[PDB]
C-alpha cells in the first residue's frame, strides 16, 4: 500500500497498491506517475523478475524489499 521502487539511476517512486491487484494494473499506475512506456518495463522483486501473467496476490511486506525497474536496452 506504500511500496517503494528504486531504479539503478536514483529515481524513487512511492506507489499504493491493493494486495489483490493485477500486474498490468501496477505497471499502468507506475507509468502514470513517471511516464514509462506501457509495454517496456522490466520489474525486479527480490532478485526475481515479476511475471506479467502472475497477478500479485500476497504482498506480505511493509517496506524494505523494493522492486527495481529497468528499461529494455538493446543494440545492433
Amino acid at each position: 500500500m506504500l511500496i517503494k521502487v528504486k531504479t539503478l539511476t536514483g529515481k524513487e517512486i512511492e506507489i499504493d497498491i491493493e494486495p489483490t491487484d493485477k500486474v498490468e494494473r501496477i505497471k499502468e499506475r507506475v507509468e502514470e506517475k513517471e511516464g514509462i512506456p506501457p509495454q517496456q518495463q522490466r520489474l525486479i522483486y527480490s532478485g526475481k523478475q515479476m511475471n506479467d501473467e502472475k497477478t500479485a496476490a500476497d504482498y506480505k511486506i511493509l517496506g524494505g524489499s523494493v522492486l527495481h525497474l529497468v528499461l529494455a536496452l538493446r543494440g545492433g
Partner: peptide, 11 residues
C-alpha cells in the same frame, strides 16, 4: 539482444 539473463545480472 539482452535477454532476461542480463536483466537479472545487472541488478
Amino acid at each position: 539482444n539482452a535477454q532476461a539473463a542480463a536483466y537479472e545480472y545487472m541488478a
